[PDB]
Amino acid sequence: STGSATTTPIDSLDDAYITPVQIGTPAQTLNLDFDTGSSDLWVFSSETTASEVDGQTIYTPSKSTTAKLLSGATWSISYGDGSSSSGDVYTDTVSVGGLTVTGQAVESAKKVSSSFTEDSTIDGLLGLAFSTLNTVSPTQQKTFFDNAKASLDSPVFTADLGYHAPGTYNFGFIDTTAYTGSITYTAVSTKQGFWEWTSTGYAVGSGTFKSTSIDGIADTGTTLLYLPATVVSAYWAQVSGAKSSSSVGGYVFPCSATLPSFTFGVGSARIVIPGDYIDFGPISTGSSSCFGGIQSSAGIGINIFGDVALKAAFVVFNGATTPTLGFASK
Ligand SMILES: NCCN1CCOCC1
């Protein structure tokens, strides 16, 4: 079997992407943030504290003839951005772009932090990192991809995010019309539960490529590209007026600038992120300064190839016994 679903930016800056997911019988459609950096499928629900719901569509398991409460199981997650959520666990029929998994763990939120409440467009998350990061306790649950994996024509899923436009998540197949050139694969370490790999270097604009190993994770649930301070400073030094701002939380630059591209290595292959993708957006509508799409990973503890980097590529998350990650230009 296969699945294909369109993912759409939640706003004019691509702060996050939402993909419609059908849960239960009859179908209840929620717009979830597909996150290759986490492993819990959680939703706003009929159990969520009313004061913490502000416009989200909720999952109501009592209206699903296929929902089954997983008694004694709870979940609680904290993300890198300081946000969090927790609740109870059901299993139900979950479909993504025509691909159906029966008995998928659907984590019903009882509590969500203010960051989730303020994003009316995100009804929950669908985790796509390794199932070893799932927070369901005591019984750890599998991701939607892990559960689907056996029934798919091939154990893979692909991310094809758009820049200020819709994109596609496909499960079980490779669309050969979605990229230019070929898909270059690279080794993945599953030791931390992430799609962790090592980039072979970088180039700033038309500069000479610098061969240097950069370990990082392919994370669709992170908005920006977070790389070591050395790389990031070499990039922003090419932009007049660029500087790190403590009040804004990272590199800003005058919105007047047209930015250089940024190339990252995948083995002997090269993925080029256009300058416009790195011009993330103005710090406010009408502001003098714009926020950088490439930021330092120094405070985080891990480099993150987030949406700014991933939207410049067709990305294959190969979930075979020994996982690998593929990148193609587009
Ligand atoms: N609510 C703050 C976090 N979110 C994350 C996703 O995009 C919009 C901002």
Side-chain angles (χ1 to χ4, degrees), residues 1-62 64-141 143-148 150-190 192-242 244-330:
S1 66
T2 65
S4 181
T6 297
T7 192
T8 302
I10 65 161
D11 61 24
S12 62
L13 308 181
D14 305 342
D15 276 305
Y17 295 78
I18 46 174
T19 313
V21 175
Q22 283 70 50
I23 309 175
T25 308
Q28 289 183 47
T29 303
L30 271 67
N31 295 326
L32 307 186
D33 182 352
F34 278 28
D35 185 6
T36 67
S38 74
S39 300
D40 289 52
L41 193 173
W42 77 256
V43 292
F44 275 78
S45 75
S46 57
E47 299 196 86
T48 312
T49 305
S51 79
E52 306 175 353
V53 186
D54 191 6
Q56 293 87 4
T57 295
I58 66 169
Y59 166 52
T60 302
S62 57
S64 177
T65 58
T66 48
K68 296 202 195 327
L69 174 68
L70 243 36
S71 301
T74 57
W75 60 283
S76 184
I77 191 162
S78 288
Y79 299 97
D81 65 3
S83 67
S84 61
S85 50
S86 62
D88 297 325
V89 187
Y90 288 82
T91 59
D92 207 337
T93 300
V94 172
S95 297
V96 174
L99 168 71
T100 302
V101 168
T102 55
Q104 168 65 41
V106 177
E107 301 169 39
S108 175
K110 289 182 68 175
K111 296 159 52 203
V112 302
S113 65
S114 57
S115 182
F116 290 115
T117 302
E118 54 192 53
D119 297 347
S120 62
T121 65
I122 298 165
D123 303 323
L125 264 69
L126 190 151
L128 294 167
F130 295 104
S131 298
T132 54
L133 290 180
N134 179 267
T135 77
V136 180
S137 177
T139 321
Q140 190 172 49
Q141 301 293 307
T143 69
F144 172 83
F145 175 52
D146 246 25
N147 281 323
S151 106
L152 295 170
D153 292 356
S154 184
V156 304
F157 73 91
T158 68
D160 181 10
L161 307 178
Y163 165 72
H164 297 0
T168 306
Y169 277 105
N170 285 331
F171 288 82
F173 74 104
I174 289 172
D175 182 352
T176 61
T177 72
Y179 53 87
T180 68
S182 56
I183 305 161
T184 297
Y185 288 85
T186 197
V188 165
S189 175
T190 62
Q192 312 200 79
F194 302 122
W195 292 88
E196 198 174 350
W197 63 292
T198 303
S199 177
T200 55
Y202 73 99
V204 170
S206 56
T208 300
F209 187 86
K210 185 161 190 85
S211 302
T212 182
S213 290
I214 307 165
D215 294 344
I217 65 172
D219 184 5
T220 62
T222 287
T223 308
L224 309 179
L225 172 52
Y226 292 89
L227 290 172
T230 48
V231 178
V232 172
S233 178
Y235 178 79
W236 292 108
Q238 296 304 301
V239 183
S240 301
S244 191
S245 162
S246 62
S247 59
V248 181
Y251 282 94
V252 296
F253 64 92
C255 293
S256 51
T258 290
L259 302 190
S261 60
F262 179 90
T263 304
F264 64 90
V266 177
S268 62
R270 305 296 180 244
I271 300 296
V272 182
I273 309 174
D276 291 357
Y277 292 24
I278 306 152
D279 174 0
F280 186 65
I283 68 165
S284 94
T285 299
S287 67
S288 293
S289 300
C290 274
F291 199 71
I294 293 176
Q295 296 292 347
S296 181
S297 59
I300 311 171
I302 199 161
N303 301 309
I304 310 168
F305 288 83
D307 304 334
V308 166
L310 306 176
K311 76 185 65 174
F314 178 82
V315 191
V316 182
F317 295 77
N318 167 33
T321 312
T322 299
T324 63
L325 235 198
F327 287 91
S329 299
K330 60 192 197 198

